[PDB]
Amino acid sequence: GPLGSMDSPPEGYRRNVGICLMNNDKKIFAASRLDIPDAWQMPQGGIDEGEDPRNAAIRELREETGVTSAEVIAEVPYWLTYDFPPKVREKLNIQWGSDWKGQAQKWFLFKFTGQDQEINLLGDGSEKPEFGEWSWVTPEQLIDLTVEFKKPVYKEVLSVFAPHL
Template sequence: MAQFFNDDGELVHESVGVIVQNPQREILLFKRVKYPFLWTIPAGHRDIGEDPRLAATRELGEETAIVAEDELQELFVGEIRGDSCVGGVDIHFWYAYLYHVKEDIVPVIEAEEGTQWGWFAPQDIPLVTLPVRYLLSQTSVRKLL
């Protein structure tokens, strides 16, 4: 996985994620089977040397079987603190994207990633992971949703 030390000497992992939105402007979320066991978006660590947009497309396909036919729209690039992972790191540098599906689809959530899934209107978002909560709270992101 891609990682680096920031200016303060802290180890930072690089993550990618995709907010998937249907024609009704609902957001696709699934419930994680691993810590922190909350609702999340398709996301994961970026591999070393992997283009962030391609990494996000890969994670989208791996976790939901959604094949992105159009390019993902960049939503957010930056550091999110408090985002713990099994690798023991609490800081992740995120590349988050938006992808619009053209019709309602039924995603195939990878069993080792999540159990339940659903389309949620912005006002009905359940308890989500810290990075998803952070992303959805950003004014620049909210304007696009």
């Protein structure tokens, strides 16, 4: 399940972003989906109409875990378009019309210069929170505990963050 990344988001793609947060241990902020205890992942969201990725990364990161006490240590050079198979394609790609085809997401690195007590994984939206449980695992560890759908994505993010990890 490879990707395309590309330093420039191609025609028709869900411009989104991801945020890689590492603590004083050089680990990564892992969070599980309020349903799957084995599905660990780091914060991530989608860029607004005309907003920057880095900013979207930072903000999305907050709105999802409340984590604000952090600084950028690095950023991914290219993007990341996780296209879906021929089956999901018709349910996703063609689900946009005839221009889209996947999801282009750029990731960023961040240092948690605060306290864990800020991570509530909650959210007042009337629907439900984002993550049910979070932890501090290593980069290669997070990729293990994370979901396949994001392992290769995060993996490519780590490779970029190698000179920083």
